[PDB]
Amino acid sequence: GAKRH
Amino acid sequence: RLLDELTLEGVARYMQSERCRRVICLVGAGISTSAGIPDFRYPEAIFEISYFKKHPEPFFALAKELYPGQFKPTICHYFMRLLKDKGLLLRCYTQNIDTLERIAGLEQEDLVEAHGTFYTSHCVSASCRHEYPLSWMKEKIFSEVTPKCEDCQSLVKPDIVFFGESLPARFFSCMQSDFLKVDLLLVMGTSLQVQPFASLISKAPLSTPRLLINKEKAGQSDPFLGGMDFDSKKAYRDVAWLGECDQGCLALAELLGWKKELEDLVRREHASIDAQ
Ligand SMILES: *C(=O)CCCCCCCCCCCCC
Ligand SMILES: [Zn+2]
């Protein structure tokens, strides 16, 4: 989904 | 097992074979460090969208301090330009926002800018969304003036994906089609720690060879948590070349008989940029 680290 | 040997030499022989027609590159910050763009490897909020919405000034202050003095693509970028020009490049997925792929001559059709780009900026107001070029963004950043829209005075934001934001729609539509038909994955300058970008490696067919050019081995499955398998007795398709991206691409070019072509291209393009 979203930009994740 | 399409590689005859799990080495750079084996990948080079594979790319010269009839079977290798469609190459996808996956690239990250390690392909731009030799161009002066820093790899960034509470303080992590400066790139998270929730804080940026609350206070955008520290991001634009940071952007001024880290804006590169010149935009000169690296040997790695021009290796991808050779892939395009030789008809091998299906797509370059980049985590980078620095526009160097475009300057090296990759076209928007060639590129999935998975994390956005500074190449363009937009007013954030839903009803306006006026677009601004990097020239305009650069002068607002360097004037230490928070960029505001000239039509509605809302904030103007570079077209980058902040942490916590969804990736662009084009990332998912391209990946759904590209990875059905990829002959070779070239993974350069990324340690595959950012999601969902890193999951791209597991989308290729299980028979597709994957070359990692990077300072460290990356993408292996975590022993606690489609992973790369370089060194097990079952390793059959993944190769790790450990070093600087420029040197790895120069080595692969030489094996392909492209070394003179790559050197001539870099020198001429760099001379042209230096002359602007
Ligand atoms: C997600 O990984 C994107 C992170 C964006 C970092 C922004 C840093 C700002 C400095 C970039 C200026 C150079 C671009 C022309
Ligand atoms: Zn506006």
Author numbering:
A (entry chain B): 14 to 18
B (entry chain A): 57 to 97, 114 to 297, 305 to 355
Give the authors' words:
Human sirtuin isoform 2 (SIRT2) is an NAD+-dependent enzyme that functions as a lysine deacetylase and defatty-acylase. By catalyzing the removal of protein acyl modifications, SIRT2 regulates diverse processes including cancer growth, neurodegeneration, metabolism, and inflammation. The acyl substrates of SIRT2 are chemically diverse and range from small modifications such as acetyl-lysine to much larger, fatty modifications such as myristoyl-lysine. Here, we report that SIRT2 readily dimerizes in solution and in cells and that dimerization affects its ability to remove different acyl modifications from substrates. In this work, we report our observations that SIRT2 does indeed oligomerize in solution, favoring a homodimer at concentrations greater than ∼100 nM.
The experiments above strongly indicated that the interaction of SIRT2cat with the myristoyl modification on the H4K16 peptide was essential for driving the dimer to monomer transition. To better visualize this, we cross-linked SIRT2cat while bound to a fluorescein-labeled, myristoyl-H4K16 peptide called “FAM-myristoyl-H4K16”. This fluorescent myristoyl peptide also caused a SIRT2cat transition from dimer to monomer (lane 4). We also mixed SIRT2cat and FAM-myristoyl-H4K16 peptide at 52 μM each and analyzed their complex with SEC, which confirmed that the protein/peptide complex was monomeric. FAM-myristoyl-H4K16 peptide and the unlabeled myristoyl-H4K16 peptide had nearly identical affinity for SIRT2cat using a gel shift assay (Kd = 1–2 μM), and SIRT2cat processes FAM-myristoyl-H4K16 peptide as a conventional myristoyl substrate. Instead, we hypothesized that the position of interface residues should change between the structures of apo-SIRT2cat and myristoyl peptide-bound SIRT2cat if that interface was altered during substrate binding and was important for the dimer to monomer transition. Thus, we aligned our crystal structure of SIRT2cat bound to myristoyl peptide to each molecule of the apo-SIRT2cat trimer to observe structural differences at Interface 1 or Interface 2. The backbone atoms near Interface 1 overlapped perfectly in the aligned structures and did not change their position when SIRT2cat was substrate-bound. On the other hand, the C-terminal helix at Interface 2 tilted inward 4° on its hinge when the protein was bound to myristoyl peptide, suggesting Interface 2 had a structural change that could affect protein dimerization. Five of the residues were on the SIRT2cat C-terminal helix, and the sixth residue we mutated (Q142) dramatically repositioned to contact the C-terminal helix in myristoyl peptide-bound SIRT2cat, but not apo-SIRT2cat.
